[PDB]
Design a protein around this nucleic acid. Structure first.
Lengths: 227, 224, 227, 227
DNA sequence: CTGTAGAAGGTACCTGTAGAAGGTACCTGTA
DNA sequence: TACAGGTACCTTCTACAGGTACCTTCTACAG
């Protein structure tokens, strides 16, 4: 695959050089906007709502909307001052917690972690330690000037780094309206449900599920192209 | 807390009325572009790149780019026909460990609907006992996609997932070694290290430092 | 300085990307042999002592002299198989001993260890740990296809990696002929010797000592060059 | 042990007859180049680059390369006048500094110093004075027609004289690229690193480390011989 | 309040490429 | 043992441009 990030997993004296690859790709069809009669691509042009004039990029400033219709203009220098840029590309591990402690509810984006230069032995040691102890590593990571939380876990023979939502962005499963909390299920009905589920149970065949809409749109495009 | 979808989980004769709630919210800081002269928000005008002129939404169409610079225009009629082909239709049940969290894309809590509680708890208990997840097809808003249904705590969680062709293979990751050449003493030392840094998960410990810094700076600027 | 080796310091899970620089340079004067009448450089021509013919580098093979006058030929395959090559450039630390356990008579060559890419925090941690515990690290390294033993220690603000002689190559000071034991030493004579040493004691001035032969040769060369 | 040098440590009125012994030996495997057709050793013939004529040692003169391609020819008389000859083989001590003032990065070669004829009491007095004052003696010495700097120190019951590099041939540890200061060190991380280093700490056992390449080559030679 | 898509700027990492010299490593000779 | 001289080399940095995948942000439409 294509490497998108070069750095190291650092927690104290440990510093394992690693590389990141995107674990998923967006195959959804993107449709360009074209003029009805000219059939040319459409471009976005910035125009002020008050001065009603075209604005160059140097005439645009960023402003945080603090109440409805009122903006505190954050100067560029302020924006760079808020960012705590790091000169060292490191997935700095801040904690190690049991795997069950963090639900896949938190997970946002998945990355494949591969060994870097002169870091295969430490990579294998960390992978085996994580698999044996059955836990994951909570870390802080920056890809391109951002800053987010991540968890490192083990999937098959690879290490997977999943960025996660911050704990205050994840809602509570105990606040869901109407969810029962009493384990008063009947044994006969439960057994019938289990039998039905087992009847519907099959194996996971990834080739069985396909994007039908994508294939249909591609076939329509091919038919219109040939005709 | 706020219902965003109201339908039913359906397979065969089983039809459980359910409601969907977003399991996560985006609290990232969003900034509005403004003019420097008058500090008014800006707006986007769609103009043609071949010849500059403002176009109404009724003056534009959608075209799929098949090669570089060449598009096939999909008329709204055929686009609607393709989009045609409120229930979460379960196709089959697989094991919990058969689908990795790298498949998961979006998370939703599932709550019982009107007169749909007994079936809801029956399905939840069956899924928990059998250790299975239900693969299904569903549409949120004019976009059909694939999802799974699992049990988290005492709730049902529906995770809309990526299609299998959209997920890369862990075997294709460059340079990843095999599980054959790990020393026992080094492994024990590494395990001891990991156990030393092991701590309980404290959700209040981790916070968005950049967002708090930006909010504090905004408050200070407002005071000034 | 000029980096001469790029790799990492590895012991178990710990990996520290580092760079090697030569701590010393040979400033001695080198003289080129020239023809007396032509003043042109000379060339080494390899000629067999028996066939009395000039040999191409593909007509020459290496041989070990197990006994005087007889050689066992070690072909390319044997030498390649004996020389174990590693896929990773690592200073594999095997031991951590006390600093005083290894005498400077073991030391052979000195190298300065600088932080590598994304390897500064771990470098600082290792330096501080070595300085505080008063320990050195025994390791195996290979600069250019020649495996040897080394020790990592702390000098001032830097980490210094010294290659060392193998223990079988170092003689024992207890077997030096004629060296007396800790026999009784006269206190007055020892005090007089101490006062003499203190009288001759001065501070270390690196500029005080210089290679006088090199300066004399350079001055003679310059004098002949001028006139 | 074989005496390789016989002289006296001299400073002012103090003159201590001494003998020098090599403190280390080169046990590396050396392979003789041989002709592949007859398995006879090869020899080097000095031939001129331009004239392409075989040159006897009386037709070869030394030359210093001040610029690339141009050589100032230094005749025998010039080189003899440049070299300083001493009628007495003496290690002439110039001053004494502390043990810690000269780093082992200066050290080049090691020799054991043994008492000479009727020079045991002075040897013991010098050893005791150097040990008690914690000092080393900087000196000028010539082994065989090459004057160099040396330091005299005490190791176990012996005196060790180390030929050392000139100060201009030793690089500065403050110019190592990327080396940081000691200000930013986390205490918890430092304690973790110290605990890890103590975990890998072991007593120095010289019998554990051996030149595996030499043993492998000797085993291969023995296998080829026995067959 | 949430889902959904489109356009736009940017740059990191890989790919394809080459020259120089500084320090490694080895071999002989030679008294 | 000392001591030097010649020889093959190759690694790291210097000097180098093109291209794509992925990040990241911003607005707008729907109900």
């Amino acid at each position: 695959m294509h490497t998108m990030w070069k750095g190291s997993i650092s927690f104290g004296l440990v510093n394992i050089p690693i590389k990141l690859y995107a674990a998923t790709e967006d195959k959804d069809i993107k449709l360009r906007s074209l003029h009805k009669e000219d059939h040319a691509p459409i471009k976005y042009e910035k125009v002020c709502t008050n001065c009603e004039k075209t604005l160059s990029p140097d005439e645009i400033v960023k402003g945080y909307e603090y109440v409805k219709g009122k903006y505190v203009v954050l100067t560029d220098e302020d924006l760079k001052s808020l960012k705590q840029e790091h000169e060292e590309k490191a997935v700095e591990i801040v904690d190690f917690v049991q795997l069950q402690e963090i639900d896949p509810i938190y997970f946002n984006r998945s990355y494949f972690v591969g060994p870097g230069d002169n870091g295969t032995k430490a990579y294998t040691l960390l992978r085996e330690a994580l698999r044996s102890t059955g836990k994951i590593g909570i870390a802080n990571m920056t890809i391109r000037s951002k800053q987010q939380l991540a968890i490192l876990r083990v999937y098959e023979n690879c290490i997977v780094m999943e960025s996660i939502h911050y704990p205050d962005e994840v809602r509570s499963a105990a606040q869901v309206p109407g969810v029962p909390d009493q384990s008063n299920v009947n044994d006969k009905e439960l057994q019938t449900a289990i039998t039905l589920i087992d009847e519907l149970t099959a194996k996971f065949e990834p080739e069985k599920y396909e994007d039908t809409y994508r294939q249909a749109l591609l076939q329509r495009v091919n038919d219109k192209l040939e005709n």
